[PDB]
Ligand binder design. Structure first.
Ligand SMILES: OC[C@H]1O[C@@H](O[C@H]2[C@H](O)[C@@H](O)[C@@H](O)O[C@@H]2CO)[C@H](O)[C@@H](O)[C@H]1O
Ligand SMILES: OC[C@H]1O[C@@H](O[C@H]2[C@H](O)[C@@H](O)[C@@H](O)O[C@@H]2CO)[C@H](O)[C@@H](O)[C@H]1O
Lengths: 134, 134
């Protein structure tokens, strides 16, 4: 099953740090911040091999009973199958601020202008090993 | 719904710190470490008013399809309705080590000799505000 933190509000001014390990033969895994598996304000997918996507980050939002919105992509990809990663996320009402394992950063709009989220989860071909949400 | 951290293994040598706030008119709330809502290796219930229990901690394990085992109790109760609390838990194969908001400690046996747990949750009349599991 997926790894999740539920109903511990991730609020404006708080920081989320997750650590994990990428599966050896991973296709892709995602880190998700939102309200449900069908309501995601910040989805960050890490694509080792997905169709034609290789070594790319793909970010988007998922709206309940509606679907995926406009994707954003980054070629920053400091991730290795079989290896640990760590990611830090903070946000204000306009922006999600993501910091990757190597210190590079990606930003993604806070499309709903949410000030808090009740669900953080990892899905796909990786596992989590630690979390700080505070 | 309950507040939980799921499928981020809480392993030997790691520490769990949760912060939260007790509901104003709370009867009781618990912090639980185990595998499911029916499989709990360390249940720590905080009883403000429960039957004849007032201002007491009650610790126990819950076995799946079996039920609650031998309760242990403590009168250490540095908790106030409406107020923040923080708790830190670590364990080895014999013992759960719990540290309360005021620095006092309670210990509870690791009855299964588990070296890792996939579920941490809070239930009842309180809410969580932060977590460090690392
Ligand atoms: O946008 C995030 C989601 O992408 C979906 O895949 C897209 C893909 O990125 C796009 O290039 C085209 O292939 O449409 C696909 C289907 O919407 C993932 O399938 C999805 O899980 C999210 O990662
Ligand atoms: O042992 C933890 C569980 O206690 C249950 O309550 C017990 C109670 O502590 C005991 O004094 C007697 O009243 O039996 C009750 C029922 O088993 C709680 O109901 C339960 O949720 C756990 O906290």
């Amino acid at each position: 099953d997926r790894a999740e933190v539920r109903n511990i509000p991730f609020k404006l001014g708080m920081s989320l740090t997750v650590g994990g390990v990428v599966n050896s033969n991973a296709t892709r895994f995602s880190i998700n911040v939102g309200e449900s598996t069908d309501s995601i304000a910040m989805h960050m997918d890490h694509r080792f091999s997905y169709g034609a996507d290789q070594n790319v980050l793909v970010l988007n939002s998922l709206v309940h009973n509606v679907g995926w919105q406009q994707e954003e992509r980054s070629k920053k990809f400091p991730f290795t199958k079989g290896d640990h990663f760590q990611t830090t996320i903070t946000f204000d009402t306009h922006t999600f601020y993501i910091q990757l394992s190597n210190g590079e950063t990606v930003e993604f709009p806070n499309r709903n202008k949410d000030a808090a989220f009740n669900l953080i989860y990892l899905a796909g071909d990786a596992r989590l090993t630690f979390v700080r949400l505070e």
